[PDB]
Amino acid sequence: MFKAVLFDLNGVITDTAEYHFRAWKALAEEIGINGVDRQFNEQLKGVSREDSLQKILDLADKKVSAEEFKELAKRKNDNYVKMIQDVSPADVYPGILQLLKDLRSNKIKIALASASKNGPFLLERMNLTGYFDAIADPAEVAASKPAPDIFIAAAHAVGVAPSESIGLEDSQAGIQAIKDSGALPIGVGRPEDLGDDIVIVPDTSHYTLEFLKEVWLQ
């Protein structure tokens, strides 16, 4: 029996991807870079703020000082934060609040393994903070997804190994991160996007305690 569930935020608990996309595209336009389109943005799922900026600069082979790099990330983040000011418990994806309740009632540990430094703010606005035993801080890990680091940190933060855990994710990078951490992935989306070798649910309402348990068995 698994002892913990490690949650991606964007794409599982809710999804603010549209707002991240709008903010990055607006930044890119401001600094003269073309090619920040929806296809390009798909690649930024699960990827750190700093890595995402670097990918965007790479499109135009643009060079910036370390200090300009910081200013640009801040500018985009300030814009993204403005865009998520109305997030509320209404934004929680279907099945998620009940899963958290059930996990908690059954003494299963709950950890956030999000690349977003806006993670704690979002969980607060959704009234979910109380379910989380720990939040892996993305500013303390060495790498973006698909590195396993964030999942390894989330599991260790609640006193268990990743191999004793289930990771829920919506992105390729995140699925790969879970795999490489040693945790059991259950993807949400399409087997085309996330793999044939793993259990995939079509949407978050299929994330139930009884479904997790049954998958932890096969």
* Residues near ligand B16 (CB under 6 A): 8-11, 20, 44-49, 52, 77, 114-118
User: Which residues are registered as beta bridge partners of 200?
Assistant: 187
Minimum CB separation from ligand B16 for residue 1, in Å? 26
Identify the helix (H) or strand (E) that includes residue 169: strand 165-169
Which of the stretches 35-43, 58-66, 152-160, 164-172 binds Mg ion when contact is defined by CB under 5 A? 164-172
Minimum CB separation from ligand B16 for residue 9, in Å? 3
User: Which residues are registered as beta bridge partners of 165?
Assistant: 4
Taking the least distance from each CB to Mg ion, the nearer of 33 and 149 is 149
Taking the least distance from each CB to ligand B16, the nearer of 8 and 149 is 8
Neighbours of 191 (CB within 10 A): 13
Taking the least distance from each CB to Mg ion, the nearer of 8 and 149 is 8
Which of the stretches 129-137, 162-170, 185-193, 202-210 binds Mg ion when contact is defined by CB under 5 A? 162-170
Nearest to 187 by CA among 208, 204, 169: 169
Contact 39, 201 (CB under 8 A): no
Minimum CB separation from ligand B16 for residue 214, in Å? 25
Taking the least distance from each CB to ligand B16, the nearer of 75 and 213 is 75
**CA-to-CA distance for 61 and 47, rounded, in angstroms?**
19
Q: Name the residue type at position 114.
A: S
Q: Name the residue type at position 204.
A: T
Return the residue of 4, 6, 10, 144 that touches Mg ion, per CB under 5 A.
Answer: 10
Among ligand B16, Mg ion, none, the one that 20 touches (CB under a kind-dependent 5 to 8 A) is ligand B16
Among ligand B16, Mg ion, none, the one that 77 touches (CB under a kind-dependent 5 to 8 A) is ligand B16
Among ligand B16, Mg ion, none, the one that 72 touches (CB under a kind-dependent 5 to 8 A) is none
Identify the helix (H) or strand (E) that includes residue 109: strand 109-112
Long-range contacts, 32-35 (Cβ 8 Å, 24+): 32/60, 33/57, 33/59, 33/60, 33/62, 34/59, 34/60, 35/59, 35/60
The reply to whether 8 sits near Mg ion by the rule CB under 5 A is yes
Taking the least distance from each CB to ligand B16, the nearer of 45 and 109 is 45
Taking the least distance from each CB to ligand B16, the nearer of 136 and 158 is 136
**CA-to-CA distance for 144 and 149, rounded, in angstroms?**
8
Q: Which residues bind Mg ion (CB under 5 A)?
A: 8, 10-11, 46, 170-171
